Amino acid sequence: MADQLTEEQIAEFKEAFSLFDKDGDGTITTKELGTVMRSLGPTEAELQDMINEVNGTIDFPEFLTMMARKMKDTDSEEEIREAFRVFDKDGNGYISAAELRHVMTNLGEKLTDEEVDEMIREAVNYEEFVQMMTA
């Protein structure tokens, strides 16, 4: 989906897409697409994938849906890191099993006690626990 990004990121991408080429129809070529991607924030495989997903013209929604992937990935990684860095006053990166089980049972969403016990048995480090839960 396109709702994983932030409004400021969309505004910056729109400003770059408008200022990169002439006014009005701001369509760009493949080389222009790569240049705009390098200016906004570079591998040849990503450029080839963006060209294949898009003759040789790239409009606004194509560039948006090509850029959204890595942006949302980095945003999710940063959010997970910031969430794992909080709460724990020690900050060492590990927590007790009892505290983790209590946080998973009495907080989060709607998880039964049996499901929480199964998740605890299937699994400490917060990042490793999140990676094991995501699978």
Curated annotation (Swiss-Prot):
The protein's predominant localisation is: cytoplasm
Residues the record lists as binding Ca(2+) 4? 128
Any one Gene Ontology MF annotation carried by this entry is: adenylate cyclase activator activity
Outline the subunit composition.
Homotetramer. Interacts with MYO1C, MYO5A and RRAD. Interacts with MYO10. Interacts with CEP97, CCP110, TTN/titin and SRY. Interacts with USP6; the interaction is calcium dependent. Interacts with CDK5RAP2. Interacts with SCN5A. Interacts with RYR1. Interacts with FCHO1. Interacts with MIP in a 1:2 stoichiometry; the interaction with the cytoplasmic domains from two MIP subunits promotes MIP water channel closure. Interacts with ORAI1; this may play a role in the regulation of ORAI1-mediated calcium transport. Interacts with IQCF1. Interacts with SYT7.
Q: How is this protein's activity kept under control?
A: (Microbial infection) Inactivated by S.flexneri OspC1 and OspC3 proteins, which specifically bind the apo-form of calmodulin, thereby preventing calcium-binding and activity.
User: Any idea which residues bear Phosphoserine here?
Assistant: 76, 96
Protein name (database record): Calmodulin-1
What would changing residue 128 to G do, according to UniProt? In LQT14; decreased calcium affinity; loss of CACNA1C calcium-dependent-inactivation; no effect on intracellular RYR2-mediated calcium release
Q: Which Pfam families match?
A: EF-hand_7
Recorded hits in InterPro entries, A to Z, give: CALM/Myosin/TropC-like, EF-hand-dom_pair, EF_Hand_1_Ca_BS, EF_hand_dom
Organism of origin: Homo sapiens (Human)
Swiss-Prot/TrEMBL GO biological process terms? autophagosome membrane docking; calcineurin-mediated signaling; cellular response to interferon-beta; cellular response to type II interferon; detection of calcium ion; G protein-coupled receptor signaling pathway; G2/M transition of mitotic cell cycle; long-term synaptic potentiation
Q: Which residues bind Ca(2+) 3?
A: 88, 90, 92, 94, 99
The linked condition is:
Ventricular tachycardia, catecholaminergic polymorphic, 4: An arrhythmogenic disorder characterized by stress-induced, bidirectional ventricular tachycardia that may degenerate into cardiac arrest and cause sudden death. Patients present with recurrent syncope, seizures, or sudden death after physical activity or emotional stress. CPVT4 inheritance is autosomal dominant. Long QT syndrome 14: A form of long QT syndrome, a heart disorder characterized by a prolonged QT interval on the ECG and polymorphic ventricular arrhythmias. They cause syncope and sudden death in response to exercise or emotional stress, and can present with a sentinel event of sudden cardiac death in infancy.
